[PDB]
Amino acid sequence: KKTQIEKLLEFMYGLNEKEVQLIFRLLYSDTKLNIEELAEEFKVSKALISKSLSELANKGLIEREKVSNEGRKGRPIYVYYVDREQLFKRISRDLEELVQASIAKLKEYIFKS
Amino acid sequence: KKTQIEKLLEFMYGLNEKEVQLIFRLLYSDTKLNIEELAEEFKVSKALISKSLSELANKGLIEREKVSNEGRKGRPIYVYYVDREQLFKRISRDLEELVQASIAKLKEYIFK
């Protein structure tokens, strides 16, 4: 089954369950992870897992950090991890902004429509 | 497509698309409404709309009012409506509680 928290992250941020799972996979990782480690674990293409990580990183839910300027292919190399305080701060802030934007919109529906 | 608010009510109260429309049909009415006109409007049987109205009233999302005990076979007759202040206060409070409960839960998961 899925927790209440999983269902909430999915709604707030428009993420599929796996993307949500990915956050918790990284939160309970001892080491930082690159694209190719994640693509092999999750059994998917680098393009797919890159899209998800990118969406998680833009939203500030995971950390994306450069560990090399040139990698075997001459491109920068990034690792992905979860910062526990940052993660908790981001969600809390997002949740307060969602509640306020909702109540405001509700007010307009229920009283001014 | 679906309104974000409609999306929120579906998520919060486990309601389908038609239940939210039912709530808004009541909200936007100038009068209380009986099951016969609502069954007709929502194109379902009286039993079905009656079951839905009863479950929405037990969620507190709408109000019910018994107006007669003299339906066929002594079955009660009800009217349904939405108390606009109470609905605002309910959803507002439920939203605030959902967020605090969520933040507490993942505070213990991220840290404890």
Side-chain angles (χ1 to χ4, degrees):
Chain A
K1 195 186 143 48
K2 295 196 305 190
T3 323
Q4 175 210 72
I5 273 62
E6 287 166 287
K7 277 209 188 182
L8 187 66
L9 306 176
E10 292 186 20
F11 174 82
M12 224 191 313
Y13 291 113
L15 307 165
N16 48 67
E17 67 177 61
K18 286 211 71 76
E19 292 189 301
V20 169
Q21 295 206 21
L22 188 46
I23 306 182
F24 289 99
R25 164 64 180 92
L26 299 180
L27 173 60
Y28 295 135
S29 188
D30 57 307
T31 65
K32 304 175 165 153
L33 303 181
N34 61 3
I35 292 284
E36 29 185 6
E37 283 168 303
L38 294 167
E40 292 157 13
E41 170 167 27
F42 278 81
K43 304 186 189 180
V44 299
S45 66
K46 288 168 59 176
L48 190 75
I49 191 69
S50 182
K51 172 72 156 49
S52 292
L53 289 176
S54 167
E55 258 180 28
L56 284 182
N58 298 340
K59 296 163 194 303
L61 298 172
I62 71 186
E63 297 302 310
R64 168 165 180 272
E65 158 195 353
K66 188 211 291 184
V67 296
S68 173
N69 285 328
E70 275 185 21
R72 257 188 339 117
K73 318 276 201 44
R75 300 183 284 269
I77 294 309
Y78 295 88
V79 294
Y80 298 84
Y81 58 104
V82 165
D83 191 308
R84 282 166 193 263
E85 293 168 25
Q86 191 59 62
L87 174 68
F88 177 74
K89 170 248 174 291
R90 177 83 276 155
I91 297 166
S92 307
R93 193 186 158 261
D94 288 347
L95 271 178
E96 246 318 310
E97 302 225 72
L98 179 128
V99 166
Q100 286 179 352
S102 285
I103 289 176
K105 195 77 163 101
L106 277 162
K107 206 176 295 181
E108 303 248 64
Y109 278 110
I110 295 176
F111 295 110
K112 296 143 179 183
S113 311
Chain B
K1 254 301 172 193
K2 246 188 249 165
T3 284
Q4 185 64 60
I5 289 290
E6 286 163 0
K7 276 185 259 162
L8 181 73
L9 301 184
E10 287 171 13
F11 181 83
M12 289 177 73
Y13 295 108
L15 310 165
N16 58 79
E17 308 76 20
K18 294 179 179 179
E19 279 157 332
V20 178
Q21 291 170 23
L22 190 49
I23 295 167
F24 270 94
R25 171 57 179 93
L26 292 183
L27 179 61
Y28 283 153
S29 185
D30 60 335
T31 79
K32 302 167 174 163
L33 296 179
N34 56 68
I35 68 180
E36 315 188 358
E37 63 197 316
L38 286 167
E40 173 176 78
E41 177 168 13
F42 283 82
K43 291 155 299 180
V44 297
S45 68
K46 258 138 77 170
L48 195 48
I49 203 86
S50 189
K51 174 182 172 283
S52 312
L53 290 165
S54 181
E55 261 315 298
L56 287 181
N58 296 338
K59 288 178 193 291
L61 295 178
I62 69 181
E63 305 298 325
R64 57 148 67 77
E65 178 183 315
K66 190 198 273 193
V67 297
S68 193
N69 281 305
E70 300 311 318
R72 281 206 188 278
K73 186 70 172 183
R75 207 130 290 164
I77 296 159
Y78 291 95
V79 289
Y80 297 93
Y81 58 106
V82 158
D83 191 324
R84 297 182 145 208
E85 298 110 306
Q86 182 49 232
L87 179 59
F88 183 66
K89 284 168 171 168
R90 159 164 277 103
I91 299 185
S92 288
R93 291 171 180 145
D94 284 354
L95 251 180
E96 182 52 35
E97 183 164 336
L98 169 50
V99 144
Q100 269 188 352
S102 288
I103 282 181
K105 192 63 183 182
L106 69 97
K107 189 189 283 178
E108 93 174 353
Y109 200 41
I110 293 180
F111 298 112
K112 293 179 179 179

PDB file of all heavy atoms in Angstrom, chain A residues 60-87:
ATOM      1  N   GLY A  60      13.790  21.223  -5.902  1.00  0.00           N
ATOM      2  CA  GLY A  60      14.564  21.336  -4.669  1.00  0.00           C
ATOM      3  C   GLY A  60      14.417  20.165  -3.706  1.00  0.00           C
ATOM      4  O   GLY A  60      14.815  20.256  -2.554  1.00  0.00           O
ATOM      5  N   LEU A  61      13.847  19.057  -4.174  1.00  0.00           N
ATOM      6  CA  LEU A  61      13.609  17.907  -3.307  1.00  0.00           C
ATOM      7  C   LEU A  61      14.842  17.012  -3.154  1.00  0.00           C
ATOM      8  O   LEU A  61      14.975  16.297  -2.167  1.00  0.00           O
ATOM      9  CB  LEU A  61      12.426  17.091  -3.828  1.00  0.00           C
ATOM     10  CG  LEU A  61      11.121  17.884  -3.843  1.00  0.00           C
ATOM     11  CD1 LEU A  61      10.007  17.097  -4.540  1.00  0.00           C
ATOM     12  CD2 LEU A  61      10.721  18.307  -2.431  1.00  0.00           C
ATOM     13  N   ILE A  62      15.733  17.041  -4.137  1.00  0.00           N
ATOM     14  CA  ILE A  62      17.018  16.354  -4.016  1.00  0.00           C
ATOM     15  C   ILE A  62      18.137  17.280  -4.424  1.00  0.00           C
ATOM     16  O   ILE A  62      17.924  18.299  -5.092  1.00  0.00           O
ATOM     17  CB  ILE A  62      17.125  15.078  -4.881  1.00  0.00           C
ATOM     18  CG1 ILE A  62      17.225  15.442  -6.368  1.00  0.00           C
ATOM     19  CG2 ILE A  62      15.989  14.119  -4.596  1.00  0.00           C
ATOM     20  CD1 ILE A  62      17.198  14.249  -7.293  1.00  0.00           C
ATOM     21  N   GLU A  63      19.327  16.911  -3.999  1.00  0.00           N
ATOM     22  CA  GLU A  63      20.538  17.654  -4.303  1.00  0.00           C
ATOM     23  C   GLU A  63      21.248  17.074  -5.529  1.00  0.00           C
ATOM     24  O   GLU A  63      21.424  15.855  -5.660  1.00  0.00           O
ATOM     25  CB  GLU A  63      21.476  17.637  -3.090  1.00  0.00           C
ATOM     26  CG  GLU A  63      20.888  18.324  -1.861  1.00  0.00           C
ATOM     27  CD  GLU A  63      20.519  19.777  -2.126  1.00  0.00           C
ATOM     28  OE1 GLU A  63      21.376  20.522  -2.659  1.00  0.00           O
ATOM     29  OE2 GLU A  63      19.370  20.169  -1.815  1.00  0.00           O
ATOM     30  N   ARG A  64      21.650  17.961  -6.427  1.00  0.00           N
ATOM     31  CA  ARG A  64      22.400  17.579  -7.608  1.00  0.00           C
ATOM     32  C   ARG A  64      23.743  18.304  -7.580  1.00  0.00           C
ATOM     33  O   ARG A  64      23.795  19.530  -7.626  1.00  0.00           O
ATOM     34  CB  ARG A  64      21.605  17.907  -8.868  1.00  0.00           C
ATOM     35  CG  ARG A  64      22.373  17.825 -10.191  1.00  0.00           C
ATOM     36  CD  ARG A  64      21.369  17.809 -11.323  1.00  0.00           C
ATOM     37  NE  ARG A  64      21.953  17.737 -12.657  1.00  0.00           N
ATOM     38  CZ  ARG A  64      22.330  18.797 -13.370  1.00  0.00           C
ATOM     39  NH1 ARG A  64      22.214  20.019 -12.865  1.00  0.00           N
ATOM     40  NH2 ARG A  64      22.836  18.632 -14.587  1.00  0.00           N
ATOM     41  N   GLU A  65      24.826  17.546  -7.492  1.00  0.00           N
ATOM     42  CA  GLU A  65      26.138  18.125  -7.242  1.00  0.00           C
ATOM     43  C   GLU A  65      27.172  17.628  -8.236  1.00  0.00           C
ATOM     44  O   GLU A  65      27.247  16.427  -8.506  1.00  0.00           O
ATOM     45  CB  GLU A  65      26.605  17.802  -5.818  1.00  0.00           C
ATOM     46  CG  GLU A  65      28.115  17.889  -5.622  1.00  0.00           C
ATOM     47  CD  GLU A  65      28.587  17.231  -4.329  1.00  0.00           C
ATOM     48  OE1 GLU A  65      27.731  16.817  -3.526  1.00  0.00           O
ATOM     49  OE2 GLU A  65      29.816  17.129  -4.119  1.00  0.00           O
ATOM     50  N   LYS A  66      27.978  18.555  -8.753  1.00  0.00           N
ATOM     51  CA  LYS A  66      29.021  18.237  -9.713  1.00  0.00           C
ATOM     52  C   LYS A  66      30.250  17.659  -9.008  1.00  0.00           C
ATOM     53  O   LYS A  66      30.728  18.247  -8.047  1.00  0.00           O
ATOM     54  CB  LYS A  66      29.403  19.484 -10.509  1.00  0.00           C
ATOM     55  CG  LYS A  66      30.350  19.182 -11.654  1.00  0.00           C
ATOM     56  CD  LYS A  66      31.285  20.332 -11.952  1.00  0.00           C
ATOM     57  CE  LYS A  66      30.577  21.526 -12.536  1.00  0.00           C
ATOM     58  NZ  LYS A  66      31.562  22.599 -12.914  1.00  0.00           N
ATOM     59  N   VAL A  67      30.755  16.520  -9.478  1.00  0.00           N
ATOM     60  CA  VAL A  67      31.928  15.879  -8.867  1.00  0.00           C
ATOM     61  C   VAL A  67      33.118  15.804  -9.821  1.00  0.00           C
ATOM     62  O   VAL A  67      34.205  15.374  -9.428  1.00  0.00           O
ATOM     63  CB  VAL A  67      31.610  14.444  -8.367  1.00  0.00           C
ATOM     64  CG1 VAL A  67      30.576  14.502  -7.261  1.00  0.00           C
ATOM     65  CG2 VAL A  67      31.122  13.563  -9.507  1.00  0.00           C
ATOM     66  N   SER A  68      32.903  16.219 -11.067  1.00  0.00           N
ATOM     67  CA  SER A  68      33.943  16.235 -12.091  1.00  0.00           C
ATOM     68  C   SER A  68      33.554  17.170 -13.238  1.00  0.00           C
ATOM     69  O   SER A  68      32.400  17.228 -13.623  1.00  0.00           O
ATOM     70  CB  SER A  68      34.188  14.820 -12.633  1.00  0.00           C
ATOM     71  OG  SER A  68      35.087  14.835 -13.734  1.00  0.00           O
ATOM     72  N   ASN A  69      34.527  17.842 -13.799  1.00  0.00           N
ATOM     73  CA  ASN A  69      34.280  18.669 -14.934  1.00  0.00           C
ATOM     74  C   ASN A  69      34.320  17.912 -16.242  1.00  0.00           C
ATOM     75  O   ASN A  69      33.650  18.276 -17.172  1.00  0.00           O
ATOM     76  CB  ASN A  69      35.305  19.776 -15.004  1.00  0.00           C
ATOM     77  CG  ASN A  69      35.060  20.854 -13.999  1.00  0.00           C
ATOM     78  OD1 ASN A  69      33.940  21.138 -13.660  1.00  0.00           O
ATOM     79  ND2 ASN A  69      36.115  21.466 -13.525  1.00  0.00           N
ATOM     80  N   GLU A  70      35.141  16.878 -16.315  1.00  0.00           N
ATOM     81  CA  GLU A  70      35.278  16.050 -17.506  1.00  0.00           C
ATOM     82  C   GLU A  70      35.108  14.657 -16.927  1.00  0.00           C
ATOM     83  O   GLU A  70      35.622  14.376 -15.865  1.00  0.00           O
ATOM     84  CB  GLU A  70      36.626  16.214 -18.164  1.00  0.00           C
ATOM     85  CG  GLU A  70      36.710  17.392 -19.111  1.00  0.00           C
ATOM     86  CD  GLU A  70      38.031  17.438 -19.827  1.00  0.00           C
ATOM     87  OE1 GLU A  70      38.694  16.391 -19.896  1.00  0.00           O
ATOM     88  OE2 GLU A  70      38.405  18.513 -20.314  1.00  0.00           O
ATOM     89  N   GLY A  71      34.374  13.812 -17.624  1.00  0.00           N
ATOM     90  CA  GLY A  71      34.059  12.454 -17.240  1.00  0.00           C
ATOM     91  C   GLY A  71      34.492  11.632 -18.445  1.00  0.00           C
ATOM     92  O   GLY A  71      34.992  12.183 -19.401  1.00  0.00           O
ATOM     93  N   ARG A  72      34.353  10.320 -18.440  1.00  0.00           N
ATOM     94  CA  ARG A  72      34.856   9.594 -19.605  1.00  0.00           C
ATOM     95  C   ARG A  72      34.424  10.187 -20.946  1.00  0.00           C
ATOM     96  O   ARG A  72      35.125  10.032 -21.936  1.00  0.00           O
ATOM     97  CB  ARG A  72      34.408   8.136 -19.554  1.00  0.00           C
ATOM     98  CG  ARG A  72      35.487   7.159 -19.121  1.00  0.00           C
ATOM     99  CD  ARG A  72      34.998   5.735 -19.286  1.00  0.00           C
ATOM    100  NE  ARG A  72      33.537   5.652 -19.331  1.00  0.00           N
ATOM    101  CZ  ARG A  72      32.839   5.227 -20.383  1.00  0.00           C
ATOM    102  NH1 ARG A  72      33.468   4.839 -21.483  1.00  0.00           N
ATOM    103  NH2 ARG A  72      31.513   5.179 -20.331  1.00  0.00           N
ATOM    104  N   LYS A  73      33.278  10.856 -20.979  1.00  0.00           N
ATOM    105  CA  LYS A  73      32.752  11.365 -22.238  1.00  0.00           C
ATOM    106  C   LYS A  73      33.008  12.870 -22.444  1.00  0.00           C
ATOM    107  O   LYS A  73      32.536  13.452 -23.423  1.00  0.00           O
ATOM    108  CB  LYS A  73      31.256  11.071 -22.325  1.00  0.00           C
ATOM    109  CG  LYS A  73      30.872   9.679 -21.843  1.00  0.00           C
ATOM    110  CD  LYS A  73      31.053   8.629 -22.926  1.00  0.00           C
ATOM    111  CE  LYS A  73      30.206   7.402 -22.617  1.00  0.00           C
ATOM    112  NZ  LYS A  73      28.824   7.773 -22.170  1.00  0.00           N
ATOM    113  N   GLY A  74      33.747  13.492 -21.525  1.00  0.00           N
ATOM    114  CA  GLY A  74      34.078  14.906 -21.640  1.00  0.00           C
ATOM    115  C   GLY A  74      32.959  15.844 -21.202  1.00  0.00           C
ATOM    116  O   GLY A  74      32.962  17.022 -21.521  1.00  0.00           O
ATOM    117  N   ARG A  75      31.991  15.299 -20.479  1.00  0.00           N
ATOM    118  CA  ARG A  75      30.897  16.061 -19.927  1.00  0.00           C
ATOM    119  C   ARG A  75      31.045  16.045 -18.422  1.00  0.00           C
ATOM    120  O   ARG A  75      31.608  15.099 -17.878  1.00  0.00           O
ATOM    121  CB  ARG A  75      29.546  15.471 -20.352  1.00  0.00           C
ATOM    122  CG  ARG A  75      29.369  15.472 -21.874  1.00  0.00           C
ATOM    123  CD  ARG A  75      27.996  14.967 -22.329  1.00  0.00           C
ATOM    124  NE  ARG A  75      27.869  13.513 -22.253  1.00  0.00           N
ATOM    125  CZ  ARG A  75      28.162  12.673 -23.250  1.00  0.00           C
ATOM    126  NH1 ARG A  75      28.619  13.137 -24.412  1.00  0.00           N
ATOM    127  NH2 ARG A  75      28.002  11.363 -23.075  1.00  0.00           N
ATOM    128  N   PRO A  76      30.567  17.105 -17.749  1.00  0.00           N
ATOM    129  CA  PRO A  76      30.514  17.112 -16.285  1.00  0.00           C
ATOM    130  C   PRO A  76      29.726  15.917 -15.738  1.00  0.00           C
ATOM    131  O   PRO A  76      28.809  15.427 -16.393  1.00  0.00           O
ATOM    132  CB  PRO A  76      29.799  18.431 -15.964  1.00  0.00           C
ATOM    133  CG  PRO A  76      30.016  19.279 -17.138  1.00  0.00           C
ATOM    134  CD  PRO A  76      30.121  18.385 -18.330  1.00  0.00           C
ATOM    135  N   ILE A  77      30.085  15.464 -14.547  1.00  0.00           N
ATOM    136  CA  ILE A  77      29.457  14.308 -13.924  1.00  0.00           C
ATOM    137  C   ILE A  77      28.773  14.745 -12.636  1.00  0.00           C
ATOM    138  O   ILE A  77      29.394  15.441 -11.833  1.00  0.00           O
ATOM    139  CB  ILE A  77      30.506  13.198 -13.607  1.00  0.00           C
ATOM    140  CG1 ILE A  77      31.101  12.610 -14.901  1.00  0.00           C
ATOM    141  CG2 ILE A  77      29.904  12.139 -12.701  1.00  0.00           C
ATOM    142  CD1 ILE A  77      30.048  12.150 -15.951  1.00  0.00           C
ATOM    143  N   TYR A  78      27.515  14.343 -12.434  1.00  0.00           N
ATOM    144  CA  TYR A  78      26.756  14.768 -11.253  1.00  0.00           C
ATOM    145  C   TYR A  78      26.341  13.600 -10.369  1.00  0.00           C
ATOM    146  O   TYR A  78      26.007  12.534 -10.876  1.00  0.00           O
ATOM    147  CB  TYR A  78      25.496  15.548 -11.666  1.00  0.00           C
ATOM    148  CG  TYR A  78      25.817  16.852 -12.346  1.00  0.00           C
ATOM    149  CD1 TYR A  78      26.008  16.912 -13.735  1.00  0.00           C
ATOM    150  CD2 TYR A  78      25.955  18.025 -11.600  1.00  0.00           C
ATOM    151  CE1 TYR A  78      26.330  18.112 -14.356  1.00  0.00           C
ATOM    152  CE2 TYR A  78      26.270  19.231 -12.213  1.00  0.00           C
ATOM    153  CZ  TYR A  78      26.455  19.270 -13.593  1.00  0.00           C
ATOM    154  OH  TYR A  78      26.783  20.465 -14.202  1.00  0.00           O
ATOM    155  N   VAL A  79      26.352  13.812  -9.049  1.00  0.00           N
ATOM    156  CA  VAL A  79      25.770  12.849  -8.123  1.00  0.00           C
ATOM    157  C   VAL A  79      24.529  13.429  -7.467  1.00  0.00           C
ATOM    158  O   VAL A  79      24.358  14.640  -7.386  1.00  0.00           O
ATOM    159  CB  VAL A  79      26.738  12.411  -7.033  1.00  0.00           C
ATOM    160  CG1 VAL A  79      27.889  11.621  -7.645  1.00  0.00           C
ATOM    161  CG2 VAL A  79      27.233  13.617  -6.228  1.00  0.00           C
ATOM    162  N   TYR A  80      23.681  12.538  -6.997  1.00  0.00           N
ATOM    163  CA  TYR A  80      22.367  12.884  -6.499  1.00  0.00           C
ATOM    164  C   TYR A  80      22.235  12.319  -5.108  1.00  0.00           C
ATOM    165  O   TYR A  80      22.611  11.175  -4.852  1.00  0.00           O
ATOM    166  CB  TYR A  80      21.274  12.330  -7.418  1.00  0.00           C
ATOM    167  CG  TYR A  80      21.334  12.906  -8.809  1.00  0.00           C
ATOM    168  CD1 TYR A  80      22.186  12.375  -9.770  1.00  0.00           C
ATOM    169  CD2 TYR A  80      20.554  14.007  -9.156  1.00  0.00           C
ATOM    170  CE1 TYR A  80      22.246  12.926 -11.056  1.00  0.00           C
ATOM    171  CE2 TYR A  80      20.607  14.557 -10.423  1.00  0.00           C
ATOM    172  CZ  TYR A  80      21.450  14.010 -11.373  1.00  0.00           C
ATOM    173  OH  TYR A  80      21.505  14.554 -12.637  1.00  0.00           O
ATOM    174  N   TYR A  81      21.720  13.130  -4.201  1.00  0.00           N
ATOM    175  CA  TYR A  81      21.479  12.657  -2.859  1.00  0.00           C
ATOM    176  C   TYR A  81      20.402  13.494  -2.217  1.00  0.00           C
ATOM    177  O   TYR A  81      19.960  14.502  -2.756  1.00  0.00           O
ATOM    178  CB  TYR A  81      22.767  12.689  -2.024  1.00  0.00           C
ATOM    179  CG  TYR A  81      23.409  14.053  -1.929  1.00  0.00           C
ATOM    180  CD1 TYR A  81      23.301  14.819  -0.771  1.00  0.00           C
ATOM    181  CD2 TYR A  81      24.132  14.580  -2.996  1.00  0.00           C
ATOM    182  CE1 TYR A  81      23.899  16.085  -0.683  1.00  0.00           C
ATOM    183  CE2 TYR A  81      24.729  15.832  -2.915  1.00  0.00           C
ATOM    184  CZ  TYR A  81      24.615  16.580  -1.762  1.00  0.00           C
ATOM    185  OH  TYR A  81      25.218  17.818  -1.710  1.00  0.00           O
ATOM    186  N   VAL A  82      19.980  13.068  -1.043  1.00  0.00           N
ATOM    187  CA  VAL A  82      19.022  13.832  -0.299  1.00  0.00           C
ATOM    188  C   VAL A  82      19.717  14.455   0.898  1.00  0.00           C
ATOM    189  O   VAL A  82      20.390  13.759   1.660  1.00  0.00           O
ATOM    190  CB  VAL A  82      17.850  12.956   0.149  1.00  0.00           C
ATOM    191  CG1 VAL A  82      17.054  13.658   1.230  1.00  0.00           C
ATOM    192  CG2 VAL A  82      16.978  12.603  -1.050  1.00  0.00           C
ATOM    193  N   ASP A  83      19.585  15.772   1.027  1.00  0.00           N
ATOM    194  CA  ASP A  83      19.906  16.469   2.268  1.00  0.00           C
ATOM    195  C   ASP A  83      18.653  16.485   3.141  1.00  0.00           C
ATOM    196  O   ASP A  83      17.611  17.038   2.746  1.00  0.00           O
ATOM    197  CB  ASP A  83      20.392  17.891   1.996  1.00  0.00           C
ATOM    198  CG  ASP A  83      20.989  18.543   3.216  1.00  0.00           C
ATOM    199  OD1 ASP A  83      20.337  18.551   4.284  1.00  0.00           O
ATOM    200  OD2 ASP A  83      22.130  19.038   3.109  1.00  0.00           O
ATOM    201  N   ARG A  84      18.753  15.882   4.317  1.00  0.00           N
ATOM    202  CA  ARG A  84      17.593  15.682   5.181  1.00  0.00           C
ATOM    203  C   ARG A  84      16.945  16.980   5.665  1.00  0.00           C
ATOM    204  O   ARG A  84      15.728  17.101   5.661  1.00  0.00           O
ATOM    205  CB  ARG A  84      17.981  14.810   6.375  1.00  0.00           C
ATOM    206  CG  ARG A  84      18.062  13.348   6.002  1.00  0.00           C
ATOM    207  CD  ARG A  84      18.752  12.520   7.061  1.00  0.00           C
ATOM    208  NE  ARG A  84      19.067  11.197   6.534  1.00  0.00           N
ATOM    209  CZ  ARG A  84      18.312  10.122   6.720  1.00  0.00           C
ATOM    210  NH1 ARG A  84      17.202  10.207   7.445  1.00  0.00           N
ATOM    211  NH2 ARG A  84      18.675   8.962   6.191  1.00  0.00           N
ATOM    212  N   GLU A  85      17.743  17.955   6.084  1.00  0.00           N
ATOM    213  CA  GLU A  85      17.165  19.217   6.521  1.00  0.00           C
ATOM    214  C   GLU A  85      16.556  19.972   5.342  1.00  0.00           C
ATOM    215  O   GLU A  85      15.438  20.493   5.425  1.00  0.00           O
ATOM    216  CB  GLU A  85      18.210  20.085   7.215  1.00  0.00           C
ATOM    217  CG  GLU A  85      18.706  19.521   8.532  1.00  0.00           C
ATOM    218  CD  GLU A  85      19.931  20.254   9.046  1.00  0.00           C
ATOM    219  OE1 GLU A  85      20.105  21.437   8.686  1.00  0.00           O
ATOM    220  OE2 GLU A  85      20.723  19.651   9.805  1.00  0.00           O
ATOM    221  N   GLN A  86      17.290  20.029   4.242  1.00  0.00           N
ATOM    222  CA  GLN A  86      16.804  20.735   3.071  1.00  0.00           C
ATOM    223  C   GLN A  86      15.496  20.129   2.593  1.00  0.00           C
ATOM    224  O   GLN A  86      14.557  20.849   2.279  1.00  0.00           O
ATOM    225  CB  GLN A  86      17.842  20.710   1.961  1.00  0.00           C
ATOM    226  CG  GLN A  86      17.507  21.638   0.826  1.00  0.00           C
ATOM    227  CD  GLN A  86      17.386  23.073   1.289  1.00  0.00           C
ATOM    228  OE1 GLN A  86      18.354  23.659   1.779  1.00  0.00           O
ATOM    229  NE2 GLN A  86      16.189  23.645   1.151  1.00  0.00           N
ATOM    230  N   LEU A  87      15.431  18.799   2.571  1.00  0.00           N
ATOM    231  CA  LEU A  87      14.242  18.105   2.099  1.00  0.00           C
ATOM    232  C   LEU A  87      13.030  18.487   2.945  1.00  0.00           C
ATOM    233  O   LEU A  87      11.969  18.837   2.415  1.00  0.00           O
ATOM    234  CB  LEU A  87      14.454  16.583   2.121  1.00  0.00           C
ATOM    235  CG  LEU A  87      13.244  15.698   1.797  1.00  0.00           C
ATOM    236  CD1 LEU A  87      12.791  15.814   0.324  1.00  0.00           C
ATOM    237  CD2 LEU A  87      13.552  14.255   2.156  1.00  0.00           C
TER     238      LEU A  87
END
